[PDB]
Design a protein around this nucleic acid. Structure first.
Length: 476
RNA sequence: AUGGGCC
RNA sequence: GGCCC
């Protein structure tokens, strides 16, 4: 978005310097072009004269203003997508109780009891369990007073900026391109879940191309469902965004909230309000307070779903701005936040759509190589979704999510102290789709030191998971 | 060091 | 706890 004000204040909000990710035995074997992100300005791996604080906020390059004609069209697309969305999900979108917003429901996982509480609770040295009882699903006086302010629509807040401790490419580590996490206060997350938690639960349960959303999917079993759907189409596009979250313009965000979360769709009047507080935000980083107009904070309850919804409307927006008679059945798509797969039988020109996306402040590029443009004829077996390829399994004839060996090597090369064993079993579930040989090679540095699941046992687990009958068929 | 999903 | 976003 657009940084409108940068003010220095005496109260310093500390960020986590020093990585918690340490090199494993695999690191010296695979030697990955990957490492922990830079969290300190004094990190020796950084390029000379590169200030980490400057790069972190470089993504805020402005807040695109839309004309009345573009806003009217966006409203049409948002309303059209909202129509489709609420037709599938239903309109039982009444507020969640405090209990259900903490403990979750079918399709909605419980609130994390031990994560960061946000501001100003972090300045008071308070943990999440001091404000909210996560066992019995009740709140303290601090949160209850804040919920009352949210009812009255008078609630104000700041976002706590944390540097994301994660593995990134050595190029990005050297460029100081550390991603940031905008931690929202716990009561905001609770109230958002109260306002739109039913809806979010319904979206997770009804994931697929019909609503254009993969939020809630299990790639192990859903790759077959998605793969067979997208293979039915003549053209498939792997569309990349840059700073997707940051580049949501206030116009687009506001209109989407207005069209999707209407009271006629069964929402409480405050659902629209609480989401609109994400448009213009105040961010606290160290001694600095930064006001930003536009963009979506990462730490909101429904960041992925909001991002997914917008992504759907953007594609419908872009196409209708260029072509005539474009409807929801003109194409098919699945998204998960900024990650997107688009398909159609019409020879659509995505290179021509570039400026139309730019009118929303979004920059689209092909994921497929550098290429120097979007091309036609690509199938689902060419594209990447959720860092996973679409490969056919030799033994079953089902689509399976295959990750790049280079990526798996990177993931395996680092871990937090004493979590290597638990991480190994978790990553094994991802590595099983690379085949027996690559599976053996990936875990070769770990042999005799940890327990590595056999390829056979995870393959049979997957077969049953993707389709129960296919596992029984290999017995008949 | 987070939201959300899945394991 | 890990992964994806």
């Amino acid at each position: 978005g657009l940084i409108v004000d940068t003010r220095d204040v005496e109260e310093r909000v500390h960020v986590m310097r020093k990585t918690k990710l340490a090199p494993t035995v695999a690191h010296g074997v695979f030697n990955p072009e990957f490492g922990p992100a830079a969290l300190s300005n004094k990190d020796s791996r950084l390029n000379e004269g590169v200030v980490l604080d400057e790069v972190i906020f470089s993504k805020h390059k402005g807040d695109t203003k839309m004309s009345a004609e573009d806003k009217a069209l966006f409203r049409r697309c948002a309303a059209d997508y909202a129509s489709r969305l609420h037709s599938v999900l239903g309109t039982a979108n009444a507020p969640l109780s405090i209990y259900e917003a903490i403990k979750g429901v079918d399709g909605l996982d419980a609130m994390e009891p031990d994560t960061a509480p946000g501001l100003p609770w972090a300045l008071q040295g308070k943990r999440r369990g001091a404000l909210i009882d996560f066992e019995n699903g009740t709140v303290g006086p601090e949160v209850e007073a804040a919920l009352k302010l949210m009812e009255k629509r008078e609630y104000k807040f700041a976002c706590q900026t944390f540097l994301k401790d994660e593995i990134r490419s050595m190029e990005k580590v050297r460029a100081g391109k550390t991603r940031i996490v905008d931690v929202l206060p716990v009561e905001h997350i609770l109230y958002t879940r109260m306002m739109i938690g039913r809806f979010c639960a319904q979206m997770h349960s009804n994931n697929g191309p019909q609503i254009g959303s993969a939020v809630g999917c299990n790639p192990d079993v859903d790759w077959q469902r998605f793969g067979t759907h997208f293979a039915q189409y003549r053209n498939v596009w792997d569309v990349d965004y840059s700073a997707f979250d940051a580049n949501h313009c206030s116009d687009a965000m506001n209109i989407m909230f207005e069209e999707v979360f209407r009271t006629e769709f069964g929402f409480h009047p405050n659902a629209e309000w609480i989401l609109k507080t994400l448009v213009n935000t105040e961010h606290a980083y160290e001694n600095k307070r930064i006001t930003v107009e536009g963009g979506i904070p990462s730490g909101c309850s429904a960041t992925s779903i909001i991002n997914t919804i917008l992504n759907n409307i953007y594609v419908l927006y872009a196409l209708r701005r260029h072509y005539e008679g474009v409807e929801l059945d003109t194409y098919t798509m699945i998204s998960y936040g900024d990650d997107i797969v688009v398909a159609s039988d019409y020879d659509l020109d995505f290179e021509a759509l570039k400026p139309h996306f730019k009118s929303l402040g979004q920059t689209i590029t092909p994921a497929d190589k550098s290429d120097k443009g979007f091309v036609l004829g690509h199938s689902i077996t060419d594209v990447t979704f959720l860092k996973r390829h679409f490969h056919m399994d030799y033994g079953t004839g089902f689509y399976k999510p295959v990750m790049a060996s280079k990526t798996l090597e990177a993931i395996l090369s680092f871990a937090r102290r004493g979590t290597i064993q638990e991480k190994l079993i978790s990553v094994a579930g991802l590595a099983v789709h690379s085949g027996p040989d690559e599976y053996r090679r990936l875990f070769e540095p770990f042999q005799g030191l940890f327990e590595i699941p056999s390829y056979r046992s995870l393959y049979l687990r997957w077969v049953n998971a993707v389709c129960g009958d296919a596992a029984a068929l290999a017995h008949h």
